[PDB]
């Protein structure tokens, strides 16, 4: 099975709702080639979904080392930060995608800005110290 | 089957126009770009011709032409995008 083939399994699984069954199809598409961004960002989403915030963020590492413009490199990675309480980051993170989004003209509605807005409250609900 | 053959067809008129879009200028080059065109307007081709023909004859025009496609398209994968709540999707 080529590696293109197995991430399409895979998707179908995610769509399923399966998600360690499709992680396992990214593994091994990215087996038959690493150097492809995206099998590394799908992976980190099924780890999103599955509650692991420090796998996600080791694929997300990968997909950036290939692909530094990827909006959804960057904003799973804010997500990964944000989960993990590193909200500076992770703001950072999610207007690089932000910026990333508006250059390519992608439309995600109103995905982004949403996103932004939560982690801004986030970092502030956390700000409490003193 | 008609079922079955309109699908290869389809994707074969679609991928030509695919690659000859617009938005995927510099994210192919014009090598890659031309072997798409040749293998789809071949299997548009033989299905012009070929309409007597059987089941595995079909299937082996279908697993040829996507062993030319998936390199191509995985190299889409591998440009400056690289080829993209809707965010939260897998690609």
Excluded at chain 1, 16 to 25: L, N, T
Excluded at chain 1, 33 to 58: G, I, S
Excluded at chain 1, 97 to 112: C, T, V
């Amino acid at each position: 099975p080529s590696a293109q083939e197995l991430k399409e399994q895979g998707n179908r699984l995610f769509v399923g709702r399966k998600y360690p069954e499709a992680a396992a199809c990214y593994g091994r598409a990215i087996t038959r080639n690493p150097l492809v961004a995206v099998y590394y960002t799908n992976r980190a989403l099924c780890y999103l979904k599955m509650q692991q915030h420090e796998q996600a963020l080791a694929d997300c590492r990968r997909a950036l080392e290939l692909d530094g413009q990827s909006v959804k490199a960057h904003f799973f990675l804010g997500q990964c930060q944000l989960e993990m309480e590193s909200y500076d980051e992770a703001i950072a993170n999610l207007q690089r995608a932000y910026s990333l989004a508006k250059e390519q003209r992608l439309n995600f509605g109103d995905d982004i800005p949403s996103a932004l807005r939560i982690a801004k409250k986030k970092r502030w609900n956390s700000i409490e110290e003193r | 089957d008609p079922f079955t053959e309109f699908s290869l067809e389809s994707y074969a008129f679609n991928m030509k126009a695919t690659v000859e879009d617009e938005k995927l200028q510099g994210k192919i080059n014009d090598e890659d770009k031309q072997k798409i065109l040749d293998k789809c307007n071949e299997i548009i081709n033989w299905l012009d011709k070929n309409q007597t023909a059987e089941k595995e004859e079909f299937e082996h025009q279908q697993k040829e032409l996507e062993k030319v496609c998936n390199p191509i398209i995985t190299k889409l994968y591998q440009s400056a995008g690289g080829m993209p709540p809707t965010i939260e999707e897998v690609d």
